[PDB]
Amino acid sequence: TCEKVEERNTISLLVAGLKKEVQALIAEGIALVWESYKLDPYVQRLAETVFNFQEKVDDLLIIEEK
Amino acid sequence: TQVLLXXXXXXXXXXXXXXXXXXXXXXXXXXXXXXXXXXXXXXXXXXXXXXXXXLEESYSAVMGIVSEVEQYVKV
Amino acid sequence: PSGKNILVFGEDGSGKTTLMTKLQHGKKGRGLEYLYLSVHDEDRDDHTRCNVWILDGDLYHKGLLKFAVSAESLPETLVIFVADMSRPWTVMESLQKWASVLREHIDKMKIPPEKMRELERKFVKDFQDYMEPEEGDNVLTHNLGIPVLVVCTKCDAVSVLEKEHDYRDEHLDFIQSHLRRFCLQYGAALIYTSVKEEKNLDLLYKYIVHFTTPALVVEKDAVFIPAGWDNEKKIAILHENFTTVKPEDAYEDFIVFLMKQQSLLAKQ
Amino acid sequence: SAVMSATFAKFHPNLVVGGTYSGQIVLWDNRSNKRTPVQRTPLSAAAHTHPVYCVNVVGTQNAHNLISISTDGKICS
């Protein structure tokens, strides 16, 4: 999704917010190393936000071209 | 202009309007601002999210200006 | 009588459609709306074809004025400068702007005939010279000349204008005196207009182009400046009653890689 | 994901499903403006750990039970 967003910066305009939210969760995963308690909830947040975010990038690509 | 392409004194009177309905089309073919109207002061709505006020009514406005020019010649 | 003319110059609307409606329409988005007049010629409709051109905006209106004014049309061309009192700064700047557009029309379209230059400029000195007498020394007139007259709209809203930002004779009389300043400097006049009131426009247009007009300063809401009621002394007298004597500052008063490189330090 | 045994869906010919190597099962829908799976399974403990080798339909549209056999000794209907 971010390659479709960086190679087509017109999508990046409407993606940036949710992109940065997934980036914040990614930064959380980058910051901690071997955090057995916050591993699974961050994995859930990463997967759910990237799932929704994937739908956002694809849906925004379609809507912007429409 | 394409449609507009002593009793003989009315020709010089109608030619002024027929030639007057052509100078507005010399605005570099686009002009990017052929709209003269605006909306109201919005508080909590979708004003900038829509097109604009004059954006949805200027084409018919300038389209009707030439019709007014044509309808006000013979009388 | 030959072909009379009228050039109404609406400033972004300013009740110009309402003004031509009360006098005698699809819409207005570009300008140059050719209109004819069937004015009572004191007997019947003698085909007084006083053509009216509704010019609004500045998006290529010089060609519109070029087709709206012929060679022999110049003496019988009653130009009308229109702006509404709801925005006083618009009238103050737009009157100078319309005078500038008229000067552009004279400096660009009136300049080819040489005989009309030496005859029209003398007739202009005659008109501005015969603009003021027969009413019952010298005003700083500019070089503009054609039948000039101004018309201000939204005049039956003095209570609204004083409730919003005037609330003193300074602003109202300031507008009146400064429009009088521009009228005395342009050799013009000024006939106000209102909603279903002040039936006074057609009087000076039928009068000058060959039904007279009144003048009012007592009402202070319907102020009519006829041809000749613009002098460089009453302007200073009007903006002296609690207002500053000739100010130049009160005009504005009444006016992937990116984020990953950022988070690279978070991994440590 | 690496889909393994993407079988049909009884009374849903166009709503094709498929178990994956990741341990999740993916449900596609060609007529949902997404050839990518529209109903993905998260890889939590509810789903399977080891690869899902055999997703398969059990029963008609009334009891559309989709058993997804995995290599974990755990299946999911």
From Swiss-Prot, chain A:
Disulfide bonds: none annotated. It comes from the Eukaryota. Signal peptide: none annotated. It is found in: Cytoplasm, Cytoskeleton. It is linked to Charcot-Marie-Tooth disease, axonal, type 2O: An axonal form of Charcot-Marie-Tooth disease, a disorder of the peripheral nervous system, characterized by progressive weakness and atrophy, initially of the peroneal muscles and later of the distal muscles of the arms. Charcot-Marie-Tooth disease is classified in two main groups on the basis of electrophysiologic properties and histopathology: primary peripheral demyelinating neuropathies (designated CMT1 when they are dominantly inherited) and primary peripheral axonal neuropathies (CMT2). Cortical dysplasia, complex, with other brain malformations 13: An autosomal dominant disorder characterized by global developmental delay with impaired intellectual development. Some patients show signs of peripheral neuropathy, such as abnormal gait and hyporeflexia. CDCBM13 is associated with variable neuronal migration defects resulting in cortical malformations. Belongs to the dynein heavy chain family. Homodimer. The cytoplasmic dynein 1 complex consists of two catalytic heavy chains (HCs) and a number of non-catalytic subunits presented by intermediate chains (ICs), light intermediate chains (LICs) and light chains (LCs); the composition seems to vary in respect to the IC, LIC and LC composition. The heavy chain homodimer serves as a scaffold for the probable homodimeric assembly of the respective non-catalytic subunits. The ICs and LICs bind directly to the HC dimer and dynein LCs assemble on the IC dimer. Interacts with DYNC1LI1; DYNC1LI1 and DYNC1LI2 bind mutually exclusive to DYNC1H1. This is Cytoplasmic dynein 1 heavy chain 1. It comes from Homo sapiens (Human).
UniProtKB/Swiss-Prot annotation, chain C:
Belongs to the dynein light intermediate chain family. It is found in: Cytoplasm, Cytoskeleton. Disulfide bonds: none annotated. GO terms for cellular component: centrosome; cytoplasmic dynein complex; cytosol; dynein complex; kinetochore; late endosome; membrane; microtubule. The keyword Transport applies. The gene is DYNC1LI2. It comes from Homo sapiens. The chain holds residues 52 to 373 of 492 of the full protein. This is Cytoplasmic dynein 1 light intermediate chain 2. Homodimer. The cytoplasmic dynein 1 complex consists of two catalytic heavy chains (HCs) and a number of non-catalytic subunits presented by intermediate chains (ICs), light intermediate chains (LICs) and light chains (LCs); the composition seems to vary in respect to the IC, LIC and LC composition. The heavy chain homodimer serves as a scaffold for the probable homodimeric assembly of the respective non-catalytic subunits. The ICs and LICs bind directly to the HC dimer and the LCs assemble on the IC dimer. Interacts with DYNC1H1; DYNC1LI1 and DYNC1LI2 bind mutually exclusive to DYNC1H. ATP binds at residues 10-17. The keyword Cytoplasm applies. GO terms for biological process: cellular response to nerve growth factor stimulus; centrosome localization; microtubule cytoskeleton organization; microtubule-based movement. Keywords: ATP-binding, Cytoplasm, Cytoskeleton, Dynein, Methylation, Microtubule, Motor protein, Nucleotide-binding, Phosphoprotein, Transport. It comes from the Eukaryota. Its main location: cytoplasm. Acts as one of several non-catalytic accessory components of the cytoplasmic dynein 1 complex that are thought to be involved in linking dynein to cargos and to adapter proteins that regulate dynein function. Cytoplasmic dynein 1 acts as a motor for the intracellular retrograde motility of vesicles and organelles along microtubules. May play a role in binding dynein to membranous organelles or chromosomes. One of its GO terms (molecular function) is ATP binding.
Curated annotation (Swiss-Prot), chain D:
It is found in: Cytoplasm, Cytoskeleton; Cytoplasm. Pyrophosphorylation by 5-diphosphoinositol pentakisphosphate (5-IP7) promotes interaction with DCTN1. Serine pyrophosphorylation is achieved by Mg(2+)-dependent, but enzyme independent transfer of a beta-phosphate from a inositol pyrophosphate to a pre-phosphorylated serine residue. WD repeats lie at residues 1-38, 47-77. It comes from the Eukaryota. Transmembrane segments: none annotated. Acts as one of several non-catalytic accessory components of the cytoplasmic dynein 1 complex that are thought to be involved in linking dynein to cargos and to adapter proteins that regulate dynein function. Cytoplasmic dynein 1 acts as a motor for the intracellular retrograde motility of vesicles and organelles along microtubules. The intermediate chains mediate the binding of dynein to dynactin via its 150 kDa component (p150-glued) DCTN1. Involved in membrane-transport, such as Golgi apparatus, late endosomes and lysosomes. Belongs to the dynein intermediate chain family. It is linked to Neurodevelopmental disorder with microcephaly and structural brain anomalies: An autosomal recessive neurodevelopmental disorder characterized by global developmental delay, severe intellectual disability, microcephaly, dysmorphic facial features, and cerebral malformations including simplification of cerebral gyration, agenesis of the corpus callosum, and brainstem and white matter hypoplasia. This is Cytoplasmic dynein 1 intermediate chain 2. It comes from Homo sapiens (Human). The chain holds residues 333 to 409 of 638 of the full protein.
